[PDB]
Write a protein that binds this ligand. Structure first.
Ligand SMILES: [Zn+2]
Lengths: 174, 511, 417
RNA sequence: AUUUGG
RNA sequence: AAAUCUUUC
């Protein structure tokens, strides 16, 4: 019962505290990777099992003429995943930590000295070349049928029910 | 070679200095300088400016972020064996957990509320009291700080008690909020380049610029100044307790405790120290000990010096200079108009730290350089090819790879040298996606993380959690076991091993 | 059961239904909806799950049975609950932010505030201090840099040979001869031999710094990359000769000679002595079976060796060359010489910057960058920014500083700015 | 930390 | 012995 020794005197701790416990070496990174052929084994595993499952994504094709200009701060607003998507990704077996990290809206300020006629937003590194980036609050609780819950009617007043059309638990507010 | 650059170059192409020297000498020198400033013979530590134009956020709810209360960085934990104080170095996570165990509290918020709610300093909050917490929080340990370019003599940082860390984190969060309210330059998400552009806009109306730095910054920001700023922004008893602990601080050097009543110890209240000068006057753009201001006549320069002296921001005569054609702040140099000064500037080299990590970091560095006008794209292409060749020379032995198929980097037994443009525009074999700066973590990074996490009797893992569960949720041993069992059962139901990695870029691209 | 949560719990469950129309959550603060004849165990009762829900502020637990479900309202407009459904319900319903009494404000004043304030008052306070007098003058001229270089040169002098800096050039011996020379040099110094590896044993240390002098520059450094790779390999493979394409070194652990029960295996913090071969013709010459070579040593820390081993010489040279001016030829002592000087010596300087773990050249470069952008500087103080001899100690860092200053002087002489 | 980098 | 309170299993 390490929980009784790590957090002696407390029967409950926050998830942040618990993870901090779960989650420096003078050896260089090269020697660490060489040790026990850990990097070689990881490369073999990646090439044999992990690599074939990687989804091939399309390449960038959009381009516009650009000219050197005064330094400016390009703002890229990368939106965060919505509840429906986050839940679908976690239920599909994706790493929950990565999904939670991506759940938050992100804003990136990058210095670029390059402008287009239409003032477009450029991809990372590809600014010189000109590769452009271009009621009831029905809530999806989960993608499963929780046991002993009401079936979704035609007019769900304010409760939480289960939808057959979409295999999920839907919460209707006001 | 840095001396013969046509443009501006700071010589950052090599890594920072390293040293195994003990921090005792540096800590002793810092304490001696603090004492000398305290006796008021070398520099000024008495704040005289008026901090009236600072909003009083006394009614703001007390906000605590738990992310910074736990970390692998060192910290000082104090024990009282038989009436004597023993200071031990331990990870900040372990120190905070021990603090919470000593005063039974579910989370730091409960500890803060209990500390602020007692009606006496001697009342018990578990196996301790507010008086004991204050007594223990004034003990610091000395550690060395190296790998800082331009600092051949490594500096001394100081590790504090978890209670001091908690109060400091609260006060610093609030001070940063006030700073952001003051001016738009202190927005949390602001790059050094954005700050430099803002400064160039601000100081465009005058002739001369005063690129300046403050000397003995930590040793000159007294506890009185911190308390004055905190009272100005309405910190209540938290600020008083923090100032009391700072005034009575002791540092354990070797095996002796040395009193350091003068000045703060290391950069901890950077927001408060900045806010001192910022609320004194709206004439500087300062980030701790780095400020920029402009003047038109010698009288304005004398007024600027008077303001700096009154704000306890002693000017550094060694590295403060006046310029008319250039501006510099946060190590970023611009022209008066706002353009980035031609030259390498702050570009830093990528040391060899893995067959694929090196390529990814080099790609990120070259992308940053090319997005600005640091170098043209063809130069970046040539540099990337050269780096790939060097990585091939360094990492192409059987101890790293046993493959010979194509589509692999030449450093992993393959015979392909991906062009920088092809890599950047996702025009490569999927194996190269990791090498992209925005791509998934490389194999080497995962291997290093696993090695660190596998180096005992540990608790059950609590990774791969549902995105909807907050990290502030209280969980017991049974709760953790149930969560792990449910997640493993669901993953098995999918006929799946450890969960598949998720990458935002790939997911958005294929959506 | 606190009255401050009556409004909070009232809005928590507006019209939620559980069976067909009946309210799912019954408020414990309302007589009409409260269940009569049963004890109250929470702010609300959930009929669907047959549970009790209680609301508590951040870090302010309430006196309720453990079975009661607690929903924590954090101070940053976020809510936490073990039951995901209740958390979602509170998040959706509490969109209208209504402040609840008892929230701990940052300005909260404790009962001991006055006592701590008096204690702070009784404690020592600082004195005013003197107001500095600042005179702004022009930046240092070529004469000042020349004066600094001459002062360094006359204070420390020069070595007869380049020592380990000469290891960047071929020693003129094949692999077998190099290995033989290294092994026989190790044997001649009475190094301990154990498990086929060499160890240097020490008993007493004269606690004073070693002799410091400026190393003259070899002609070139063709094997800089090879030398750095060898040093990187030696961080762990110590005690046996390590071979490269055109050079070899021997990193022997330096271990205390406690006695019969002495350290046998190197630990994390054990230092290394790196021995390298160069062309003969200096004091450190060694001969064996007709093979002659200059054997030069370097005592390196673990962190020093690690830092030196990770540097990328070729990429750094190319990046510097991207936007560089015409480098002039220089002599053995870093002096402008267009008659017999060599431009390859600059490469050597770069190698020195890689071998110096204190990276004093970085500080010199930062100060020179300040110098080139400066219209006026503080009198008699900015000039005292190139005087870094006190901040470093050793032959390698001293030579690095001296040649950084020489490079600054050469830039001022050849390409005035 | 040598097992295992030309 | 050396980049010397470091080379401290
Ligand atoms: Zn010699």
């Amino acid at each position: 019962s390490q929980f009784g020794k790590s957090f002696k005197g407390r029967t409950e701790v926050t998830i942040t505290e618990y993870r901090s416990h779960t989650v420096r070496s003078l050896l260089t990174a090269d020697k660490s990777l060489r040790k026990s052929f850990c990097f070689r084994n990881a490369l073999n595993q990646f090439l044999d099992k992990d690599l074939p499952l990687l989804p091939i994504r399309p390449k960038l094709e959009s381009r516009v003429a650009v000219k050197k200009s005064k330094l400016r701060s390009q703002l890229s607003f990368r939106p965060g995943l919505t509840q429906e998507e986050a839940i679908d990704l976690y239920n599909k077996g994706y790493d929950g930590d990565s999904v939670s990290g991506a759940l938050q809206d992100r804003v990136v300020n990058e210095p670029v000295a390059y402008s287009s006629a239409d003032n477009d937003k450029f991809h990372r590194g590809l600014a010189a070349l000109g590769y452009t980036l271009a009621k009831a609050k029905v809530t999806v609780l989960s993608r499963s049928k929780w046991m002993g819950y009401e079936d979704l009617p035609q007019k769900p007043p304010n409760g939480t029910f289960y939808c057959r059309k979409r295999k999920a638990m839907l919460l209707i507010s006001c | 070679m840095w001396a013969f650059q046509e443009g501006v170059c700071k010589g950052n192409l090599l890594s920072g200095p390293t040293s195994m020297k003990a921090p005792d000498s540096a800590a002793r020198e810092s304490i001696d300088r603090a004492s000398e400033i305290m006796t008021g013979k070398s520099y000024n530590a008495v704040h005289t400016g008026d901090l009236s134009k600072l909003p009083n956020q006394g009614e703001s709810p007390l906000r605590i972020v738990d992310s910074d209360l736990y970390s692998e960085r060192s910290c000082c934990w104090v024990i009282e064996k038989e009436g004597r104080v023993v200071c031990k170095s331990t990870t900040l996570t372990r120190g905070m957990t021990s603090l919470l165990n000593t005063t039974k509290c579910s989370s730091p918020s409960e500890l803060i509320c209990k500390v602020l709610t007692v009606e006496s300093l001697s009342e018990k909050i578990g196996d301790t009291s507010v008086e004991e917490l204050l007594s223990h929080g004034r003990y610091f340990k000395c550690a060395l700080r190296d790998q800082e370019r331009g600092k051949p003599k490594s500096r001394a940082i100081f590790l504090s008690h978890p209670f001091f860390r908690l109060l400091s984190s609260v006060v610093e969060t609030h001070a940063r909020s006030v700073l952001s309210k003051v001016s738009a330059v202190y927005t949390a998400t602001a790059s050094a380049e954005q700050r430099a552009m803002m400064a160039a806009q601000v100081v465009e109306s005058r002739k001369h610029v005063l690129n300046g730095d403050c000397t003995k910054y930590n040793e000159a920001i007294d506890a009185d100044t911190l308390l004055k700023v905190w009272d100005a922004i309405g910190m209540g008893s938290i600020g008083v307790m923090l100032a009391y602990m700072v005034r009575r601080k002791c540092v354990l050097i070797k095996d002796t405790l040395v009193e350091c009543p003068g000045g703060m110890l290391m950069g901890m209240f950077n927001a408060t120290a900045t806010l001192a000068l910022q609320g004194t006057t709206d004439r500087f753009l300062s980030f701790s000990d780095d400020f920029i201001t402009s003047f038109n006549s010698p009288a304005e320069l004398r007024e600027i010096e008077d303001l700096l002296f009154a704000s306890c921001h002693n000017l550094s005569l060694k590295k403060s200079y006046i310029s008319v054609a250039s501006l510099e702040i946060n190590s970023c140099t611009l022209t008066r108009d706002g353009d980035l000064a031609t030259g390498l500037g702050c570009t830093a080299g990528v040391p060899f730290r893995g067959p694929l990590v090196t390529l990814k970091q080099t790609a990120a560095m070259l992308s940053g350089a090319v997005d600005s006008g640091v170098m043209p794209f063809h130069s970046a292409e040539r540099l990337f090819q050269i780096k790939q060749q060097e990585c091939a020379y360094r990492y192409n032995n059987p101890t790293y790879t046993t493959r010979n198929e194509d589509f692999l980097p030449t450093c992993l037994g393959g015979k392909t040298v991906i062009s920088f443009q092809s890599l950047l525009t996702w025009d490569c074999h999927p194996f190269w996606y990791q090498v992209h700066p925005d791509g998934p973590d490389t194999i080497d990074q995962k291997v290093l993380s696993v090695l660190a996490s596998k180096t005992r009797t540990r608790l059950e893992a609590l990774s791969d959690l549902d995105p909807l569960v907050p990290h502030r949720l209280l969980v017991s041993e049974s709760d953790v076991s149930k969560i792990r069992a449910a997640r493993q059962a669901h993953l098995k139901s999918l006929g799946l091993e450890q969960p598949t990695n998720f990458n935002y870029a790939i997911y958005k691209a294929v959506q | 059961m606190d009255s401050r949560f009556a409004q909070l719990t009232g809005v928590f469950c507006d019209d939620f239904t559980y069976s067909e129309g009946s309210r799912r959550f019954l408020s414990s603060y309302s007589t009409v909806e409260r269940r009569p004849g049963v004890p109250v165990e929470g702010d609300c009762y959930d009929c669907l799950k047959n549970k009790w829900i209680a609301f508590e502020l951040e870090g302010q637990p309430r006196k309720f049975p453990k079975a009661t479900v607690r929903c924590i309202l954090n101070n940053d407009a976020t809510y936490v609950c073990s039951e995901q459904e209740y958390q979602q319900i509170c998040k959706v319903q509490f969109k209208d932010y209504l402040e609840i009494d008892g929230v701990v404000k940052v300005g909260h004043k404790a009962s001991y505030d006055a006592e701590l304030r008096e204690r702070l008052l009784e404690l020592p306070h600082p004195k005013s201090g003197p107001k500095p007098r600042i005179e702004w003058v022009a930046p240092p001229r070529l004469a000042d840099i020349s004066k600094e270089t001459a002062e360094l040169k006359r204070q420390y002098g020069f070595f007869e040979c380049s020592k380990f800096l000469a290891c960047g050039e071929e020693c003129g011996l094949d692999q077998e001869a190099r290995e033989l020379i290294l092994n026989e040099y190790a044997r001649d110094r009475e190094f301990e031999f154990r498990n086929g590896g060499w160890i240097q044993r020490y008993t007493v240390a004269s606690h004073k710094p070693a002799t410091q002098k400026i190393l003259p520059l070899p002609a070139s450094a063709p094997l800089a990359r090879e030398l750095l790779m060898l040093i990187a390999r030696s961080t762990t493979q110590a005690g046996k000769v390590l071979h490269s394409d055109n050079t070899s070194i021997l990193a022997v652990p330096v271990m205390r000679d406690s006695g019969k029960h002495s350290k046998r295996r190197p630990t994390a913090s054990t230092h290394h002595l790196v021995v390298g071969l160069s062309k003969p013709g200096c004091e450190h010459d060694f001969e064996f079976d007709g093979y002659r070579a200059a054997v030069h040593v370097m005592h390196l820390d673990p962190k020093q060796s690690a830092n030196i081993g990770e540097q990328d010489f070729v990429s750094t040279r190319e990046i510097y060359k991207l936007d560089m001016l015409e480098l002039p030829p220089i002599s053995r002592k870093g002096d402008l010489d267009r008659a017999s000087g060599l431009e390859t010596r600059w490469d050597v300087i770069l190698l020195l910057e890689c071998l110096d773990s204190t990276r004093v050249s970085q500080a010199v470069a930062q100060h020179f960058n300040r110098h080139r952008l400066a219209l006026s500087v503080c009198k008699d103080e900015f000039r005292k920014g190139y005087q870094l001899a006190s901040e470093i100690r050793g032959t390698i860092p001293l030579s690095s500083l001296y040649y950084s200053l020489c490079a600054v002087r050469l830039r001022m002489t050849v390409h005035p700015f």
